[PDB]
Symmetry: D2
Subunit: 144 residues, 4 copies
């Protein structure tokens, strides 16, 4: 498996993602990032049922939560309804309990925006810091 298969993703900007200024409403970018992260994990081969609560086939609710503790974005060029965006993800293990993902959005080969999302692994019930789930660790390693 070539990592581009799960780190190079694509999406098309839809009409409801825009505001009356005629361009993407800013916070939608973060939704797109989160969804591309989920898509990446899926494409690498992880099962949603093992990572995300609310999943149909979980035998138990996943034990480790991955709350976002920081995120940011820079908006460089306007993004429009119907734009085909090329998304490149670059994950980084920060320590045994945390990781971040950088997201770069290109349209017609030019960078239109980029974002960074940082997660901490905690026990979902105690909220104490804990080790990253094994599947997330495999994905981080494979994506090096």
């Amino acid at each position: 498996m070539n990592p581009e298969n799960w780190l190079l993703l694509r999406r098309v900007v839809r009409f409801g993602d825009t505001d009356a200024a005629g361009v993407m409403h800013f916070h939608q970018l973060f939704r797109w990032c989160h969804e591309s992260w989920e898509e990446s994990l899926e494409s690498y081969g992880l099962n949603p049922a093992d990572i995300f609560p609310g999943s149909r086939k979980s035998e138990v609710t996943p034990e480790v939560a991955l709350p976002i503790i920081h995120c940011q974005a820079d908006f460089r060029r306007p993004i429009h309804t119907g734009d085909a965006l090329a998304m490149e993800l670059r994950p980084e293990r920060l320590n045994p309990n945390s990781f971040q993902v950088h997201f770069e959005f290109r349209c017609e080969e030019q960078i239109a925006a980029h974002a960074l999302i940082r997660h901490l692994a905690i026990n979902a019930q105690t909220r104490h810091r804990c080790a990253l789930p094994e599947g997330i660790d495999r994905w981080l390693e494979a994506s090096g």
Copy 2:
């Protein structure tokens, strides 16, 4: 307590609620309905912790889920950023296990949209139909 206190509500249309057509994006109406229903329950005097999962002060997760089984809306006049909307709610008990709420949205005294949301009471763990929670029944009765 006069029921208008919890059935007549107000909100202002915000920029992110609009699309590049220069008017409210259609599905936002439903979010506004749901939020006004929550506001109504709050204004009548019910505690979120007794009705909605995810609440900070629940001693246990609420036992009865109120899934939406049907909803609809008619859009009659365009709705714009910065519009002050007067919302009137009209709840109806349908049977011991179900209710619906009608929402009318006025701007400058004219009806711009209206919607209807129907809920069924089910046990959150078994998903069997069950009786409406007592607080919801009090609200329905008070709102007659």
Copy 3:
């Protein structure tokens, strides 16, 4: 071109689409419908720039608006994060100035929800009723 290519679509339910009840938050369904309608038009071969305002490559803003005048949905089975949903679209010309689209959502071959969205064609500047744009008429005809 076989119409299934643009009327049979797929999407995966993402974590942000769910609420603390552990299932899809109801109004997201409508967003999914609208986005699948846009996807259908794209897949049939229409150019966003000719239909939707806010598009990058429009020579002029499209002259005909397609406001939603009515929509509704029935929710039959719970929908969960990571569910693969098979979406089937069935468009219907209603008259020379209007159409609706029916959306059926299946998961593991069973209908989980369905929705209906009705549009009116109006001149974007005058807001008078007008004929459907030619591309939308081609799509309706091809989808018969």
Copy 4:
């Protein structure tokens, strides 16, 4: 007029703002920030019609766009459905063409999250940098 009237704002976390982890879904924070900024401008006394496109009563579409070029947030404590959040806004003029707003969210007197949004003033048609609109400059000055 005391600036707290437009810089100290309040909102209640609603059920649709949460995900299946049982807490606010991260990107909603940014929507809340943007809406509180709009609320602040309104509360200071500015007219939406002069600042935001899509407004009902604009004689012409506002000439100056205020695109967000950067934003970020830190999430410190979990935020739950029904939480009453105290929002404090701290605007800063950066130069004649730009400003940022810092947003602090408190619940039960403790900081749960904070965010920063930076805007650039551009001519809406040319997209060249330009001076801040006079009303935004009045608000910035009053909020010092």
